[PDB]
Amino acid sequence: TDRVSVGNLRIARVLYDFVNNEALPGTDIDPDSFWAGVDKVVADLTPQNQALLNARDELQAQIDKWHRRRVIEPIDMDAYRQFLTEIGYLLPEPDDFTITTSGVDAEITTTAGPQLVVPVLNARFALNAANARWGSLYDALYGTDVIPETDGAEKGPTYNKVRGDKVIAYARKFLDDSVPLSSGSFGDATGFTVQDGQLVVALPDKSTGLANPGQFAGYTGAAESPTSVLLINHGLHIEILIDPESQVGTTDRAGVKDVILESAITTIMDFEDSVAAVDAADKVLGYRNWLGLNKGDLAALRVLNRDRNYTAPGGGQFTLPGRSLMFVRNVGHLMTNDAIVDTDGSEVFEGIMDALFTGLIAIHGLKASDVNGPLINSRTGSIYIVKPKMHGPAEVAFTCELFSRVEDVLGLPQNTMKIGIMDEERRTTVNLKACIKAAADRVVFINTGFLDRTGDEIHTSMEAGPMVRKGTMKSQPWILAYEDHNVDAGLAAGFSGRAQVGKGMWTMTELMADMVETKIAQPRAGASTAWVPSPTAATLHALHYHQVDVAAVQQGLAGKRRATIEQLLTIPLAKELAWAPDEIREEVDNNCQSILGYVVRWVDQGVGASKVPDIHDVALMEDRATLRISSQLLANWLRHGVITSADVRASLERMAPLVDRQNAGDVAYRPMAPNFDDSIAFLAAQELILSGAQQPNGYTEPILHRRRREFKARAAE
């Protein structure tokens, strides 16, 4: 392209140069030995990678055939389960065990709080996410519909005092609920002082302390007239900023300017479903941002925050981290990428490359940043890698062996590279204990989702019959059981106090009132973390962890088995004649708009995540798993005669101009309508649906990557 020869590999020059000039210096790793390591690891692990992919296909073919030779309407669970066991899909449950993972930071082992996920190719967003460890509660309340924009309290071009007062009152109630006063309410506070290491809150008629003095964590400024007061509840910090001479402070009874919440405790820097990266140039853009993050010098000048200084209650000095602790999500076992090809021209597995390169790069986050002093990331010496889309314990074991070999190449101690196991494929769900066991000395989390897991659910039972609607899926018995089972398995493996048990993303970015009402379900269900789409959502989701004592919840769940294998295996088949014709067309339109809305940005602009208007103009921020579910759902309805290929076409044709219109705010946008078959993005959308049934596990990357490359190539006219 050109390329650099290293043993059997031919490495794109842009990648070779990036590694030598930017990634390797400072790690003390010999460049020649690194490259030899890449060649050797790729040579050794590629056949097993392929074998695992082939095993997926064989298992799916047998399941397809199982359904096709049967006609008995309600599936016979006893026979179905027996079959899955016979073919090696459902494996024996291993004996009880406790994970042994060590060298993990407090943010992961102990603290319960929000976890942000952000596309690594977007430097600005990545920087904001890393800085989202602390976030303004006032900004999050004033800025969103959590304070409804009723008559009088609407957002204007400038400060609305009626709304501001609602913000202040909301936050006073939060303080009363989270760090209660011995007597009275924060609502009536007139001032704060620190006396003999104790926080003293002035009320109109008297003073009072905290009902739990231990929740006083520190302050800034003079004890007798502090600039801020720091509190702690359920392990998360709350900072009341005091400034009577500020916009908001001047209107406040105690001169309070803002309430800052410790928010995004951890952040996942994403190389997978939220980015579009289809070649060496794209991968290098991502690797370079990941590098800047770990070295602490990424600047877009928007830069990375320093740690925060405080005075302890007794008068001593301390610091708290000002940055979100970073994971990186590598791609999974499926895709290859032409950033490296072999002597035959065969592309190298992208997951293997990500392990080597993001692993190398992460070394920088384990050492002092030349910018602001202290090392950026893990003080305990771990590298946290989220590994998506695995199917079963052999695939987890493979990932661990991959990490083991990379560690050897990088000169890292064994088990430095920790694994966040995504539970987003059915064959992992039903063998979860075994998957955790295979990574018992590396695992730092498990997590559940809606989108990918539902995509796998549909594809796996594609031949069984028509599935329920997309919106219906999120409340089906299989998924509710999957959610509980994930928690059960993690807690039984001793995750409490050792590893994160995590839940899925809130995708409706503008519907924050609904988020605050609803997402509380997740920490109530024993999750020590869950996914948020923005720093703003991280600050709001933090509220939930102040209301819910996750550590106590997990202790209470101990020993409980709340999901059976039968519940897990309950296929979401639609009942006979479940929909009217208008409902069918609505669901078709929903899915085509979902696919078109996402695919047009991906293919034409290389954007893998953004705020996308749905069919009802609700802003959704979904990653690529949205494509997997929608295309699989339509493929399934087309497969079983629910809709015809003309229904699909007409819907694509109806939805495309609507998508075009929804993208009017974009200088770079290129309309799909009316020259449909001249738009590579439109053809991509069509191809995802019509070829959906034949994509391995319904994965959208093979078609998406090809189409994006096609667009890129023709752009080079």
Ligand X SMILES: O=C(O)[C@H](O)Cc1c[nH]c2ccccc12
> CA 194, CA 176: separation in Å to the nearest integer?
19
Cβ atoms of 7 and 39 closer than 8 Å: yes
Q: 328: closest CA among 263, 254, 271, 257?
A: 271
**Is 533 among the residues that bind ligand X (CB under 6 A)?**
yes
Select the residue whose beta carbon is closest to ligand X and give its number: 449
Token couple for 84: 């899955």
Least separation in angstroms between CB 91 and ligand X: 24
Non-local (6+) Cβ contacts of 666 within 8 A are none
Least separation in angstroms between CB 498 and Mg ion: 24
Instruction: Give the residue with the Cβ less far from ligand X, 166 or 453.
Output: 453
**Is 449 among the residues that bind ligand X (CB under 6 A)?**
yes
Instruction: Give the residue with the Cβ less far from Mg ion, 194 or 625.
Output: 625
Q: What is the 3-class SS of 125-189, one letter each residue?
A: HHHHHHHHHEEEHHHHHHHCCCCCCCCCCCCCCCCCHHHHHHHHHHHHHHHHHHCCECCCCHHHC
Contact positions with ligand X (CB under 6 A) in 93-132: 117
Q: 601: closest CA among 694, 670, 553?
A: 670
Q: State how far Cα 217 lies from the chain centre.
A: 30
**Is 451 among the residues that bind ligand X (CB under 6 A)?**
yes
Tell me which of 10, 329, 405, 707 is the catalytic residue.
329
Non-local (6+) Cβ contacts of 555 within 8 A are 496
Largest pairwise CA distance in the chain? 84
Q: 442: closest CA among 417, 423, 422?
A: 417
Tell me how many residues contact Mg ion (CB under 5 A).
Answer: 3
Cβ atoms of 290 and 123 closer than 8 Å: no
**Is 239 among the residues that bind ligand X (CB under 6 A)?**
no
Contact positions with ligand X (CB under 6 A) in 493-522: 504-505, 507
**Is 452 among the residues that bind ligand X (CB under 6 A)?**
yes
Continuous H helices in 217-338: 280-295
Least separation in angstroms between CB 92 and ligand X: 28
Least separation in angstroms between CB 388 and Mg ion: 5
* Chosen from Mg ion, ligand X, none, partner binding at 274 (C-beta under 5 to 8 Å by type): ligand X
Half-sphere exposure of 641 (CA within 13 A, CB side): 4
Contact positions with ligand X (CB under 6 A) in 602-621: 609, 621
Instruction: Give the residue with the Cβ less far from Mg ion, 428 or 539.
Output: 428
* Segment contacting Mg ion by CB under 5 A, of 57-65, 238-246, 417-425, 627-635: 417-425
* Chosen from ligand X, Mg ion, none, partner binding at 377 (C-beta under 5 to 8 Å by type): none
Least separation in angstroms between CB 482 and ligand X: 12
Q: 208: closest CA among 229, 189, 227, 222?
A: 189
Residue 623 known to be catalytic: yes
Report the first-to-last Cα separation within the chain, whole angstroms. Answer: 17
* Segment contacting ligand X by CB under 6 A, of 55-63, 181-189, 269-277, 553-561: 269-277
The residue from 39, 252, 258, 270 that contacts ligand X (CB under 6 A) is 270
Instruction: Give the residue with the Cβ less far from ligand X, 178 or 632.
Output: 632
> CA 445, CA 111: separation in Å to the nearest integer?
13
The residue from 252, 262, 452, 587 that contacts Mg ion (CB under 5 A) is 452
Residue 44 known to be catalytic: no
Least separation in angstroms between CB 633 and Mg ion: 16
Least separation in angstroms between CB 276 and ligand X: 13
**Is 423 among the residues that bind ligand X (CB under 6 A)?**
no
Tell me which of 623, 624, 660, 708 is the catalytic residue.
623
Instruction: Give the residue with the Cβ less far from ligand X, 416 or 626.
Output: 626
Specify which residues 258 forms β-bridges with. Answer: 241
> CA 374, CA 693: separation in Å to the nearest integer?
51
Least separation in angstroms between CB 268 and ligand X: 8
**Is 625 among the residues that bind ligand X (CB under 6 A)?**
yes
Cβ atoms of 391 and 697 closer than 8 Å: yes
Angle (deg, nearest 10), helices 550-557 and 477-492: 90
- Enzyme catalytic residues: 329, 623
Which residues of this protein are in contact with ligand X, per CB under 6 A?
117, 270, 273-274, 424, 449-452, 504-505, 507, 533, 609, 621-623, 625
Which residues of this protein are in contact with Mg ion, per CB under 5 A?
424, 452, 625
